[PDB]
């Protein structure tokens, strides 16, 4: 809707949209991001984060080494745009941030850095 989205990530390591729009007019956006199916976060726990498209890998791979404790993200990662916690089935997270911080003429994605899920949990994200 005008200025909040709600996601969902499942237990066949979807998300129910993989593309999000961005109104220029808002002044923060909120991400909502809840979990269907009944598998446990250490096992098939999502987050939703957000970096430019030519970061996300980076961001992917050191997110991997930080571990499960980290939500699977490094620590004041300077790329990281906004991101949610890791959640697993029945939990729920959701993330505002500054619509400011769109640079247009910059290509964004957002991404579950949770290791192996990234491939398939992708997506872009249009600010218009
Ligand atoms: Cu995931």
């Given at each position: 809707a005008e200025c909040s989205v709600d996601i969902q990530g499942n237990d066949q390591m979807q998300?129910?949209?993989?593309?999000?729009?961005?109104?220029?007019?808002?002044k923060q956006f909120t991400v909502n991001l809840s979990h269907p199916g009944n598998?446990?976060?250490n096992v098939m726990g999502h987050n939703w984060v957000?970096?430019?498209?030519?970061?996300?890998?980076?961001?992917?791979?050191d997110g991997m080494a930080s571990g499960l404790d980290k939500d699977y993200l490094k620590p004041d990662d300077?790329?990281?745009?906004?991101?949610?916690?890791?959640?697993?089935?029945?939990?729920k997270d959701s993330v505002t941030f500054d619509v400011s911080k769109l640079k247009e003429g910059e290509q964004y994605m957002s991404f579950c850095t949770f290791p192996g899920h990234s491939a398939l949990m992708k997506?872009?994200?249009t600010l218009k």
């Open positions: 998300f129910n949209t993989n593309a999000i729009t961005v109104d220029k007019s808002c598998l446990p976060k957000l970096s430019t498209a030519a970061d996300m890998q980076g961001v992917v791979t300077s790329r990281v745009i906004a991101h949610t916690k890791l959640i697993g089935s029945g939990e997506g872009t994200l």
